[PDB]
Design a protein around this ligand. Structure first.
Ligand code: VX6
Lengths: 271, 43
């Protein structure tokens, strides 16, 4: 098992509510990763122990080029340490804010990567439930990495009831108090594509009840600068009825995605 | 901040890692992990 002394600590990458993330180098392989450090007493006081256990259980069993890898984890007297893949280009949300909006090539590439990662999850009956820019990181070549699994669930048989995620990204079925399934991630993917291309989510409103109202009416108003292809894809994802939403394989196969994505798979080991 | 964790020393190491990926499954995924049950218990 690992110990904190097995790592050179480089610098803090981000502050957290329960502990910081550090750029770290594993000493024996001189391998650069991120170390998320969590305080045991703070987690216990806040009563989020089973919550954290669930996030670790899900993320540590996922292996996909577009999902941030959790290599392993360890603990000592006071701290829990998560050994995470380092995403050299950082937060996707920072990049979106910096540019205002992404061009079609950038957005289509992200969408292919997202759809592939989400397909991998759904194949395993994992629903993410909180796809938004803030939960995505970027790799060495700008590849999307799903980073955060805080609202995620393994749902093999039972439909779900928990209202979760983020206001602007909530699907109609969550707002209306219906049961939901994996198709919530299809909805969020459509909101994400819109936000990528426009720089604001589609149902943006001054109040939570107006936002709710716009979502359940699917009050989608496309800006004039969007291509027909991008609107086609967004429209096919943002369907009121979950069963009518374009499947993830359908996103990957969509002609706008095919025509615009410049997705590159990272090099793999390497026998 | 140590030398390795900034500038082009970092850039260089990061590039090398992308193009020459190690066997993380073997190197890290095979190494023992604490039981999730034990994570809030004695270390
Ligand atoms: C965990 C992680 C983070 C990274 N990469 C980075 C990289 C980064 N950078 C600073 C800004 N430059 C322009 C790019 C590099 N800043 C952060 S700040 C930050 C901190 C934490 C998280 N993510 C999480 O804690 C996920 C696990 C829930 C994302 C970004 N994270 N690799 N792995």
């Amino acid at each position: 098992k690992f110990t904190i002394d097995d790592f050179d600590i480089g610098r803090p990458l981000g502050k957290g509510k329960f502990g910081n993330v550090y750029l770290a180098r594993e000493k024996q392989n001189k391998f650069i990763m991120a170390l998320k450090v969590l305080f045991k007493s703070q987690l216990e006081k806040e009563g989020v122990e089973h919550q954290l256990r669930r996030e670790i259980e899900i993320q540590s069993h996922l292996r996909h080029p577009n999902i941030l890898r959790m290599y392993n984890y360890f603990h000592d007297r006071k701290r829990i340490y998560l050994m995470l893949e380092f995403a050299p280009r950082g937060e996707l949300y920072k990049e979106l804010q910096k540019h205002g909006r992404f061009d079609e090539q950038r957005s289509a590439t992200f969408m292919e990567e997202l759809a592939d990662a989400l397909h991998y999850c759904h194949e395993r009956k994992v629903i993410h439930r909180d796809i938004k820019p803030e939960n995505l990181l970027m790799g060495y070549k700008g590849e999307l990495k799903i980073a955060d699994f805080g609202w995620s669930v393994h749902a093999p048989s039972l439909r779900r009831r928990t209202m979760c995620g983020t206001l602007d990204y909530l699907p109609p079925e969550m707002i209306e108090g219906k049961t939901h399934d994996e198709k919530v991630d299809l909805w969020c993917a459509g909101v994400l594509c819109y936000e990528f291309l426009v720089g604001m989510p589609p149902f943006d409103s001054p109040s939570h009840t107006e936002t709710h109202r716009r979502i359940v009416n699917v009050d989608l108003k496309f800006p004039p600068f969007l291509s027909d292809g991008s609107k086609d894809l967004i429209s096919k994802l943002l369907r009121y009825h979950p069963p009518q939403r374009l499947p993830l394989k359908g996103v990957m196969e969509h002609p706008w995605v095919k025509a615009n994505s410049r997705r590159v798979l990272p090099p793999v080991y390497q026998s | 901040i140590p030398a390795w964790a900034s500038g082009n020393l970092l850039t260089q190491a990061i590039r090398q890692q992308y193009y020459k990926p190690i066997d993380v499954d073997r190197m890290y995924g095979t190494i023992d992990s604490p039981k999730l049950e034990e994570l809030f218990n004695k270390s």
